[PDB]
Amino acid sequence: MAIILPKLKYALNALSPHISEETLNFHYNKHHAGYVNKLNGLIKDTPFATKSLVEIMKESTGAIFNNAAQIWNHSFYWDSMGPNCGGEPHGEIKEKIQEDFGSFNNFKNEFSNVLCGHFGSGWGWLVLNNNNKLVILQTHDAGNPIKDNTGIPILTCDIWEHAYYIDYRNDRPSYVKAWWNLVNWNFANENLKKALQ
Amino acid sequence: AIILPKLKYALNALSPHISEETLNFHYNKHHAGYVNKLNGLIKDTPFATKSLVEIMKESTGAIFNNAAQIWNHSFYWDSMGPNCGGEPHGEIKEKIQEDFGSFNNFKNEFSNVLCGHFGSGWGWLVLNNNNKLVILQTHDAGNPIKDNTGIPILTCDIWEHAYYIDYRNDRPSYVKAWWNLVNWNFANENLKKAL
Numbered sequence: 001m002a003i004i005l006p007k008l009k010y011a012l013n014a015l016s017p018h019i020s021e022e023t024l025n026f027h028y029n030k031h032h033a034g035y036v037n038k039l040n041g042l043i044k045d046t047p048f049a050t051k052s053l054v055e056i057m058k059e060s061t062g063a064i065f066n067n068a069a070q071i072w073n074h075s076f077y078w079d080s081m082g083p084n085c086g087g088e089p090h091g092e093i094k095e096k097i098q099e100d101f102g103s104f105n106n107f108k109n110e111f112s113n114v115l116c117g118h119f120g121s122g123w124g125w126l127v128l129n130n131n132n133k134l135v136i137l138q139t140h141d142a143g144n145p146i147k148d149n150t151g152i153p154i155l156t157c158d159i160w161e162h163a164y165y166i167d168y169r170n171d172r173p174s175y176v177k178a179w180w181n182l183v184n185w186n187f188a189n190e191n192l193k194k195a196l197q
Numbered sequence: 198a199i200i201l202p203k204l205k206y207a208l209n210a211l212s213p214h215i216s217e218e219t220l221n222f223h224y225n226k227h228h229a230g231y232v233n234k235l236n237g238l239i240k241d242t243p244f245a246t247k248s249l250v251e252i253m254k255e256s257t258g259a260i261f262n263n264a265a266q267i268w269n270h271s272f273y274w275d276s277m278g279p280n281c282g283g284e285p286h287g288e289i290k291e292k293i294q295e296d297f298g299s300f301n302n303f304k305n306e307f308s309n310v311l312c313g314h315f316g317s318g319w320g321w322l323v324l325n326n327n328n329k330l331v332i333l334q335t336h337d338a339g340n341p342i343k344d345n346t347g348i349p350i351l352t353c354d355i356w357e358h359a360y361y362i363d364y365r366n367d368r369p370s371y372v373k374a375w376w377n378l379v380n381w382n383f384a385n386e387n388l389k390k391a392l
């Protein structure tokens with residue numbers, strides 16, 4: 001199967017109690033795996049069959065896009081988190097956030113507001129925009145900043161209901177608050193360095 | 198000002214097809230929250246003196262999202278009931294036979310549409326201007342009144358919060374279960390008015 005589900009970099013329970021093992025089980029092994037299985041079915045007998053996931057995402061529309069972009073968004077989501085993470089940013093991203101938001105607390109406040117405010121299925125992003133500045137963006141359904149060409153993804157947070165409904169029911173804000181304990185600044189730093197190159 | 202309409206049945210009335218816990222969150226958190234958010238949004242606007250349908254028709258963005266979701270959810274609750282489901286009866290049965298060939302045909306296609314919808318949205322049975330029943334889907338808070346695509350007859354919510362407590366990712370089992378709840382009486386009332 002041309003497209004393979006990338007492994008999580010940590011155990012299924014590694015984000016607990018912020019996001020439960022049960023959530024990771026459904027979200028990764030059911031939803032995420034499902035988008036991979038679905039895309040592989042869809043790209044058969046198309047020119048997409050031999051393109052990379054990223055190329056498919058950038059060049060498709062309809063169901064192919066929806067599945068391709070979701071696979072990519074989820075992998076970026078999992079990599080945006082980790083055990084032994086969260087807290088204050090550190091390394092290059094700490095200083096960049098200071099420059100572009102004034103403080104980590106300012107960034108945290110605006111990001112949480114955006115994440116809490118998104119109507120329907122979607123994603124909040126920290127991105128390096130096309131003017132070399134960190135900004136917060138939101139996208140709807142499977143959308144992302146690479147497809148939109150609105151900047152280079154640094155971190156993402158999924159706010160589709162399946163991301164939090166097991167653990168928090170309707171209480172998205174509690175999910176967003178808990179997510180701050182999981183934010184992987186090492187990942188952000190890796191993305192920033194590539195982005196600025 | 199805008200008021201949340203009463204359910205026509207108790208919170209457990211749809212169980213086990215939709216749990217009482219689901220109805221509790223869906224009605225008392227989601228549906229109630231749409232009403233509360235809308236009232237805060239329309240205070241001090243020309244929308245404060247308009248009906249829900251008028252607000253729905255004349256708004257965009259947050260006001261639309263909340264107003265349409267209030268109307269959509271009431272239509273959803275009224276589209277179900279205890280003592281409902283199974284084979285259609287009365288005028289809607291005949292009309293489904295005319296427009297879909299059979300109930301089995303309707304049921305399978307409606308199910309496909311409900312299961313196939315990507316992200317948050319709704320499936321609809323509506324009567325169009327040629328007095329023909331048709332299946333529509335809409336995204337997020339969208340609906341056929343906003344869209345002028347026909348007079349709604351029934352709806353089914355496929356937002357994840359509709360089923361996630363009871364079925365997790367298995368939307369098709371929720372859809373299957375929903376057929377034990379579909380309120381043919383409400384369909385017949387709607388059809389009588391629409392025709």
Ligand SMILES: [Cl-]
Nearest residue numbers: 021022025026
């Ligand atoms: Cl589990």
Ligand SMILES: [Cl-]
Nearest residue numbers: 281380381382
């Ligand atoms: Cl009935």
